[PDB]
Amino acid sequence: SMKELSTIQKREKLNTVERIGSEGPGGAYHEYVIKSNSMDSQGNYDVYETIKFQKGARKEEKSQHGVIDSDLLEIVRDRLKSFQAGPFSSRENACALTHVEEALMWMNRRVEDRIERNVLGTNTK
Amino acid sequence: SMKELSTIQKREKLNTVERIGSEGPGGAYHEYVIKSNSMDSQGNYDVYETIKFQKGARKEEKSQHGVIDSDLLEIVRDRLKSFQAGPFSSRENACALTHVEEALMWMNRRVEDRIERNVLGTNTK
Ligand SMILES: Nc1ncnc2c1ncn2[C@@H]1O[C@@H]2COP(=O)(O)OP(=O)(O)OC[C@H]3O[C@@H](O[C@@H]1[C@@H]2O)[C@H](O)[C@@H]3O
Ligand SMILES: Nc1ncnc2c1ncn2[C@@H]1O[C@@H]2COP(=O)(O)OP(=O)(O)OC[C@H]3O[C@@H](O[C@@H]1[C@@H]2O)[C@H](O)[C@@H]3O
């Protein structure tokens, strides 16, 4: 099945984000589609992109390799840094960037804690 | 051309994220690759995914449609929400999720400000 995400942005959205499939390992969904909101005059949706996540903890049998959430945030972190070094910097970009980095820091704190407890990549609290 | 991002996570990374090509509109890069740190039985990457961004402000001549940064953050917001409803919820996930959402709110504050000033989709401060 598929459900569209309710996004924080409400107006002038370029793309919609769709959640594909059912809940899987960790309680998470593992496939998302980014799709143009509007069509051109020939009916084409210029953007139609699928992102598939790592599905199951990496050391567990039958897990499948994929993207991980920090990868996406690192890309947006780099984009925001570029925008701030470019001709159209803004305070909003500055604040978004700090929050994206703080998210990444919390995700990495989780990783390093799981390394310390020797549970990274396993289905263990 | 290609450059590996320096990520907040330093250890046990699933994937490497790379920036492809040169700086373009807005001072930003517009192509990123996510590739696994693991190889399959034939020495090919288990994961090799490419993200291409909206390139040029949307109303300018020759701009190209693509992913936008808030789409990626919305996917991560949904994943963290799922993790927090699932069997392996954690305090780090909750703090990460609030920061992702606050980043999305700042990004939307920028959008709505540019709408009010009638500059959204144009190369103007
Ligand atoms: N913030 C988070 N990031 C990643 N996983 C998280 C998480 N919060 C909870 N989980 C779940 O907690 C267990 C071990 O987690 P991790 O040890 O970090 O596993 P990892 O090898 O990186 O695989 C990650 C993959 O495992 C599955 O969910 C995991 C897995 O059930 C799911 O498919 C995910 O894509
Ligand atoms: N947080 C941010 N998000 C998007 N753009 C940002 C930004 N900070 C600065 N900019 C740049 O500032 C100008 C007007 O910006 P936006 O009006 O928001 O334009 P948008 O139509 O959404 O296209 C976006 C595309 O325009 C190009 O960069 C823009 C563009 O030079 C670039 O290729 C980007 O992918």
From TrEMBL, chains A, B:
Source taxon at top rank: Bacteria
Molecular function GO terms recorded: nucleotide binding
Pfam families found in the cross-reference section: Acb2_Tad1_hairpin
Keyword set includes Nucleotide-binding: yes
Keywords: Nucleotide-binding
InterPro entries: Acb2/Tad1_hairpin
Domain Acb2/Tad1 hairpin: 49-112
Protein's name according to its UniProt entry: ABC transporter ATPase
